[PDB]
């Protein structure tokens, strides 16, 4: 019992995970998890440890404490659970927007890794760890398991799929497996995996590519469904737009981690309302026959439901100039004015609209669940402009 | 290897299930599963075997072949998988209405048991077995595990909850556990469990009372959700109406197995259209101020969407007398006439309506996903009448 190691002591009584076994222990008065690896594993351990010294500074990469006689031991930050146990054993009704936050943090950690020229290559819910609560009861997600990590030489876009063990079935990008694919895998491999993890969290446990038995088979086939994402819920429309890109079969169509972080999927209601306002300001003096406006109005009739005037509450329809009820731009101009004159807005109107800014913006997104997604895609034409830097990653 | 027993031979190489272990083997030139039980289990085995001799004749009760030296052995019908493995490891996109059929068969077997005065007391997806395909590639579900079965004396409504081990957490009716409940458990205990199994299959793996960790806790609380059942899909509305009854906290409000079998949840589209027609015929000469008609029209405005004339395709709206667009009864009268004069119906109309009878009935249920459920509830006033015996269990 209570085996003691140089600078790390752990009792085999507490077993945490299991070919290797992990135990709860202690290092230098710190509660930490401990890793023991076989001789054949002893080589993968030196790879992992190397990279943790290199990339652990980031809050969303698991902290590495030390390695210290027949086998090899690895101490790391002690966690409350994996992302898998989190999704399986927790009522989201009580957790609020915390799941989204865990996806955001996880994305931050991946973008830290990619910026270091490190492809993870094996991201999955079992790999993502949930931290013990800090002094303020806050928790975070962290990336772990760098055994299959590869570090690309500077100026290298990809890596050989052969000579490197692929992740375990279900979360592997098609470029890793298919004999047919000529192009070599790149960083987007992790975006595909992450795309699957995004869906696994939002759906509380489903997968784009079906049940665990046929996932990898479906991945190569390109047969995926996002059944859990409703086509007329604003939150679901946004999530589908991002996840569809992340899990795309063409790796070149998948967003980079830094794109993912800029995506409306992570925007507060406040920021959503700000985007709507910056767009409306941006296009206020733009010509109707112009490119920016043309693009915003294509397929817009569907977006506003043919006549958005006929789909708002009577209090606001009464308080409404030249507004054309089929124009997305006019729907935005109205919002920009109702937001600018909210105080001067009568009480029944303000009561029906709701409080600024959260209830206000949600008054419209609830009514027009494609308006934000439509607008975000259309306004990419201005991604380069300084005004829209908070909403797009340009570089 | 290949241990041989008197009339049963099995090889411990093939292990099927595991405190007891089951193996694939053979009895009298028959492929069968084999059960070995501990001495403490040796008592529960005599109970189970007794009841299988008694109730195995039913196709949806697992067939029992024989029992034949230090321990006890039990041979039974060999199955392809449990209901749990079925839901977890199978793409329903290829299986069609087979899952519903498996629920129907399972219900048939339970009603066989109840008619014998046998309460199962431990129904769960792991207990329900899927048969090997027969000569025609057809399969069936079957009840097993009678270890916790109780057989009620004649004329007995209930049984003591104490002195009998409850099922394992997650599927147990609240009457089995709560110290507060005065009324003793009855057959409806199995209906609650079945209600949970119904949802577990339709949702491809969710549970009314939340994730496995808090299910039993939520069961006692009465905190259940059927999030997977859409409020405007006809199929989902029907399923919710039945499942809500089966999992009711008040055992007296749960339907008997024979009620469940009569429920529209198991009706073919053909039979649905027949019910609509029998209802329309039944109420054709019923007074508007009458009880049957009054009941059918309460909350009916919502059911037909204020004006069903405004929610049907232009081909049929053109071909439409005195029909009042807010009356459920008039919506039914129209259907009864369009079905009676389908041949004499013009081609564009018949093209928009679809083929009799499946596409026809689905033309309306798709448009009015509460019409069948509303009508089924309202017309219970005629459950006793001979005409509606195919739709209600009266006895
Ligand atoms: Cl780059
Ligand atoms: Cl918190
Ligand atoms: Cl009875
Ligand atoms: Cl078949
Ligand atoms: Cs860290
Ligand atoms: Cs890079
Ligand atoms: Cs799920
Ligand atoms: Cs949500
Ligand atoms: Cs800001
Ligand atoms: Cs049988
Ligand atoms: Cs009975
Ligand atoms: Cs599910
Ligand atoms: Cs369905
Ligand atoms: Cs019939
Ligand atoms: Na641009
Ligand atoms: Na009656």
Asked if B31 contacts B78 with a C-beta cutoff of 8 angstroms, the reply is yes
Give, rounded to a whole angstrom, the gap between the first and last alpha carbons of chain A. Answer: 55
CA distance B193 to B172: 6
| Shortest CA gap B192–chain A (Å) | 22
CA atoms lying within 13 Å on the CB side of residue B280: 21
CA distance A328 to A323: 10
Residue B203 touches chain A, beta carbons under 8 Å: no
Residue A89 touches chain B, beta carbons under 8 Å: yes
Asked if B37 contacts B43 with a C-beta cutoff of 8 angstroms, the reply is no
CA distance B123 to B143: 8
Asked if B265 contacts B239 with a C-beta cutoff of 8 angstroms, the reply is yes
Asked if A257 contacts A107 with a C-beta cutoff of 8 angstroms, the reply is yes
Resolution (A): 2.6
CA distance A192 to A245: 9
User: What are the residues whose beta carbon lies below 5 Å from ligand 10 (ion)?
Assistant: B 63
Strands (E), chain B: 3-5, 8-17, 21-27, 30-37, 64-66, 72-77, 79-82, 118-119, 129-131, 141-142, 150-151
Comparing alpha-carbon positions, the chain A residue that sits nearest to B230 is: A230
The pair of structure tokens assigned to A88 is: 């399986």
Residue A227 touches chain B, beta carbons under 8 Å: no
Domain B78-268 has CATH 1.10.510.10: yes
Question: For residue B357, is the peptide bond before it cis, meaning its omega torsion is within 30 degrees of 0?
Answer: yes
Could you give the residue range(s) of every CATH 1.20.1440.180 domain in chain B? 269-395
Architecture of domain A1-77: 2-Layer Sandwich (3.30)
* One CATH from 1.10.150.120, 3.30.450.70, 1.10.10.10, 1.20.1440.180 for B269-395: 1.20.1440.180
Neighbouring CB atoms inside 10 A of A85's CB total: 16
Give, rounded to a whole angstrom, the gap between the first and last alpha carbons of chain B. Answer: 55
Asked if A253 contacts A174 with a C-beta cutoff of 8 angstroms, the reply is no
CA distance A364 to B210: 32
The pair of structure tokens assigned to B226 is: 């059927």
The pair of structure tokens assigned to A390 is: 């908070």
CA atoms lying within 13 Å on the CB side of residue B103: 27
What per-residue string of b and e applies to A275-302 under the rule 16 or more CB within 10 Å gives b? bbbbbbebbeeeeeeeebbebbbeebee
Residue contact A89–B211, C-beta within 8 A: yes
User: What are the residues whose beta carbon lies below 5 Å from ligand 5 (ion)?
Assistant: A 63
What kind and span of H or E run contains A317? helix A314-318
- Select the residue of B91, B210, B214 nearest A211 (Cβ to Cβ): B91
The pair of structure tokens assigned to B8 is: 């049963």
What per-residue string of b and e applies to B48-60 under the rule 16 or more CB within 10 Å gives b? bbebbebbbebeb
Q: Which residues from B are below 8 Å from A205, CB to CB?
A: 205
DSSP β-bridge partners for residue A150: A119
Comparing alpha-carbon positions, the chain A residue that sits nearest to B225 is: A93
Cα A207 to its chain centre, rounded Å, is 15
C-alpha of residue B142 to centroid of ligand 10, in Å: 8
CA distance A173 to A249: 8
Could you give the residue range(s) of every CATH 3.30.200.20 domain in chain B? 1-77
CA atoms lying within 13 Å on the CB side of residue B375: 29
Q: Is A177 annotated as a binding residue?
A: no
């Amino acid at each position: 019992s209570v085996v003691i190691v140089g600078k790390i002591s752990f009792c085999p009584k507490d077993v945490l995970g299991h070919g290797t076994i992990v135990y709860r222990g202690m290092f230098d008065n710190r509660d930490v998890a401990v890793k023991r690896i076989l001789p054949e594993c002893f080589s993968f351990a030196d790879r992992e440890v190397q990279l943790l010294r290199e990339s652990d500074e980031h809050p969303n990469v698991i902290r590495y404490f030390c390695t210290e006689r027949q086998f090899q031991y690895i101490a790391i930050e002690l966690c409350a659970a994996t992302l898998q146990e989190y999704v399986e054993q927790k009522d989201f009704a009580h957790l609020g927007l915390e799941p989204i936050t865990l996806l955001q943090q996880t994305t931050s950690g991946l973008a830290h890794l990619h910026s270091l020229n490190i492809v993870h290559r094996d991201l999955k819910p079992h790999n993502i760890l949930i931290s013990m609560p800090n002094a303020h009861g806050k928790i975070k997600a962290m990336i772990s398991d760098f055994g299959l990590c590869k570090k690309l030489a500077v100026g290298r876009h990809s890596f050989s799929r052969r000579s490197g063990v692929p992740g375990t079935e279900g979360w592997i990008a098609p470029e890793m497996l298919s004999e047919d694919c000529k192009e070599n895998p790149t960083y987007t491999v992790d975006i595909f995996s992450a795309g699957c993890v995004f869906y696994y969290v939002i759906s509380e446990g489903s997968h784009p590519f079906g049940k665990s038995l046929q996932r990898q088979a479906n991945i190569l086939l390109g047969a995926c469904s996002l059944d859990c994402l409703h086509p007329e819920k604003h939150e679901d429309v946004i999530a589908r737009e991002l996840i569809e890109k992340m899990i795309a079969m063409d790796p070149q169509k998948r967003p980079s981690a830094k794109h993912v972080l800029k995506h409306p999927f992570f925007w507060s209601l406040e920021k959503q309302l700000q985007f709507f306002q910056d767009v409306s300001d941006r296009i206020e003096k733009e010509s109707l026959d112009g490119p920016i406006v043309k693009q915003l109005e294509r397929g817009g009739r569907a977006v506003v439901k043919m006549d958005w005037r006929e789909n708002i509450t009577v209090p606001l329809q009464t308080d409404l100039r030249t507004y054309k009820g089929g124009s997305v731009r006019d729907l935005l101009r109205a919002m920009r004015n109702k937001k600018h004159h909210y105080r001067e807005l009568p009480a029944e109107v303000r009561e029906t609209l709701g409080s600024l800014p959260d209830d206000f913006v949600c008054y419209f997104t609830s009514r027009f669940p494609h308006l934000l997604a439509h607008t975000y895609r259309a306004m990419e034409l201005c991604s380069h402009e300084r005004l829209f830097q908070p909403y797009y990653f340009h570089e």
